[PDB]
Ligand binder design. Structure first.
Ligand code: MN
Ligand code: MN
Length: 89
């Protein structure tokens, strides 16, 4: 594996970890693991990125590149859940 790979757990709107530092200007992967009972949707407004993860399932999201900066994200299917963030640096 020559690509950095991170992991986020989604569980009924709670995202862990809620803060993820990632490299900027770099292609990388995030394993999105939904351990809850409802489908989840990774969504970031700024990045225009949305990815569904069915309950009790996993999918691996590819981020092609991020300019340095901070990118809030959340489970769009569970409003009021964790406001998480990617910190690209
Ligand atoms: Mn959505
Ligand atoms: Mn929404």
């Amino acid at each position: 594996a020559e690509e950095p790979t991170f992991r986020l757990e989604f569980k009924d709107g709670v995202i862990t970890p809620d803060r993820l530092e990632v490299p900027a200007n770099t292609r990388f992967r995030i394993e999105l693991v939904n351990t809850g009972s409802m489908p989840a949707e990774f969504e970031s407004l700024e990045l225009r990125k949305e990815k569904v993860i069915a309950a009790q399932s996993e999918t691996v999201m590819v981020i092609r590149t991020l300019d340095p900066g901070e990118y809030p994200f959340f489970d769009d299917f569970h409003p009021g859940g964790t406001p998480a963030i990617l910190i690209a640096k």
